[PDB]
Amino acid sequence: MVPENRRKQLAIFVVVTYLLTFYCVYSATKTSVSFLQVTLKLNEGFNLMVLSIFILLNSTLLWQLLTKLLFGELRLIEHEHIFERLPFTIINTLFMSSLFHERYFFTVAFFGLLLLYLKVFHWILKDRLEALLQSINDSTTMKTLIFSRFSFNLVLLAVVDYQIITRCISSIYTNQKSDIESTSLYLIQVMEFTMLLIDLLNLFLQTCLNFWEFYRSQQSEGKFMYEKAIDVFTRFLKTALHLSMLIPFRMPMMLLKDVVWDILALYQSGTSLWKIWRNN
């Protein structure tokens, strides 16, 4: 998590950034006439980078507080997991960013940071569900309101990504311009957020599976079979969407990476299918 020296380093960082931004703003103000000119002066390189640093700091702090509100506190296992998983995804997102140049500099970063936060949320959600399953308490039946809390988390993230993808499809449809690269950018956003939605769907069907299991076990084949069936189903949906979207664009790298790891996941799915045949 946060070592003591890291915490004091972060406090120093915050105060340095605040002081720098205040000084830059006051400087660009006192040497200008009207709002337009001080705007054109803030957009200058050094002040631009300083303001972007400020924006990043405030966004990370906002997301930290949003997490503290939503998921309370994280268990150490979750933190180990996320600390381990971050770098590969960060590199992949930077690679998505490097696809478009100065033209799409800022909006891509907007959507990328949004995707990063949503992926972190999805992962901590999956880990919290797995904790709930281990920590099941059979003193009471799994009341409608406990599943209601968990499904409140689920539907929160669900309506978030759904609003995003629907608004992006609407933006694509209304923008039949010569700016085709914007359509491709929006298609990347669709791929990412729809992947997140399919992951949420997978989790939803698995938790309904466990709910019906608890239902029948309290009221009145191996579950492994159905869990792996849903696994194959969702991975197949992933592969289908990835093909149907990235083949039109003919992407040099995202296409190859995605489909290679997808065919490796299909290798795993065939092995699980043989497990099913043994369990048939």
Next chain:
Amino acid sequence: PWPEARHLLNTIAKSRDPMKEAAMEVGFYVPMDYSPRNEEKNYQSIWQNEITDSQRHIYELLVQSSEQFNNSEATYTLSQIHLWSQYNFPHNMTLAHKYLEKFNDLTHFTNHSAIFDLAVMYATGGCPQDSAKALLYYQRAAQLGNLKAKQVLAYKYYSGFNVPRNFHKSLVLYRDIAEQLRKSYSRDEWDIVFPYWESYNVRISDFESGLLGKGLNSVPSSTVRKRTTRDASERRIIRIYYAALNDYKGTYSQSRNCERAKNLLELTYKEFQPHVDNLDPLQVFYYVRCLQLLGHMYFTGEGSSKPNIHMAEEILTTSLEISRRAQGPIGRACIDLGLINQYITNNISQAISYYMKAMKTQANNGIVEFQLSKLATSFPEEKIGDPFNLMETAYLNGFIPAIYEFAVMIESGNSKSSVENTAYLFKTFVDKNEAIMAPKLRTAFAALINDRSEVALWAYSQLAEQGYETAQVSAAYLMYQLPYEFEDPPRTTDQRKTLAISYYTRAFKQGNIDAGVVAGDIYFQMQNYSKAMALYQGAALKYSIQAIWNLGYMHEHGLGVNRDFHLAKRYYDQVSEHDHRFYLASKLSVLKLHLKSWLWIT
């Protein structure tokens, strides 16, 4: 005592112009506000500490002579001293008025220079302003035969300022002045080569940031010439050519010095001619350019006693020979050769060939088409273009005598011979000769770069009335500037601002845009809110960014129009649509708009 006065004054060298003395071997400070008490105390300190005793004696003798006897020639001289701040004496605008009034009382409206100056001082209200007396004085000084007075009256009749609009009177006056100016030139200066007078027609406050902010103003900067510019073997010819150029067409801080250029060119030519064949890759360009410049300097005769026609012809044909291989430029060389063999020698067909080779070049301004049209008029069997078309292209390009010749031609025959176009042509000529009607720009700049600021404001106020837009906006800038943000506004008197507003407004109506925005800001500070939006809209119709954004800001507040947030968002989306770099500010302003709207909570 006046003979002794003149004999003493003979030794002081009235005014030093650093633009000229700096040619043997930066910028200036402008003030922000003004206060008469501080100025008179500065005047007292200057008289108490600086002046030398001989100057004390001289000034006392001048006062005694111009007071005791009606000398009528010490009054004028002392008025000029106190007005143009010459002979190291300081500036007074009230005592110069007193003495010019006494002189005018003496010489019973026979001297028109003093009448012109008095009309200016009565129209600008420096000393209240009264337009009728100034107009009477303008008429009177026009009768006596002054050019600038006729010009200011013609302009005042042409723009509609202070009198109703009228085009025929302006046409008549402009024709009169154009005729006099045409007759003030010789035959050689008109036909062969036009004299080269350094123009100071720039507007001040373009050496600084600019007007209404840098990177924000619409009209492009007008500073045509300021120190043009662009390892041991190569760079030597570059440096030598650029020194030659920067000492041929003098700059603003340092005027021209031609003898140095002549010496340098002849030296480098005599030194480089033996082994030119080794400079193929790039240096032949700059060498032949220097060669052509020196040939032109010989043909005209500047920096020397008299022209050397035959040597110039040999030098130019050698330049053209060297240019044939390595495909160098041929502009100035062909132009000058054509000018020579058409008048100096009597072989015309060669001049025709030269010109026809020179028409499509970049270096010509108007000379080619001018000579072609004149010859076609003299020899109709040449089959060379159309006279009207040639003179038209010439006028369009920017050559001075072609303007007048085209005006005469279009007045001689319909060809859309309305009054507006003809008035515009004649005004363009009268304004653009600039060598007789606007000599005071040099004096103004000189007095301005030696810390005497008020006299520069006076010269620029005098040149404003004639219609020299740049002088208008310059006097305006010296009277009121735009204050930096979160800072107290200037403390100038009311008359200063009410005159700066008129100068800004006339500068705007003349064609400039930024003056509209700045006058709108003057009114906004003056708390009018009524006549501001007028100028703001008048400039917004010409696509000014700050104008539009400020009109939005004006709308969305309670001032003027009442809180119409919709039109505010409309104008902000407009300013975001037209130009790009104002994206962030437009978006942030719409965001403030939304925040105001929601804070709906109440």
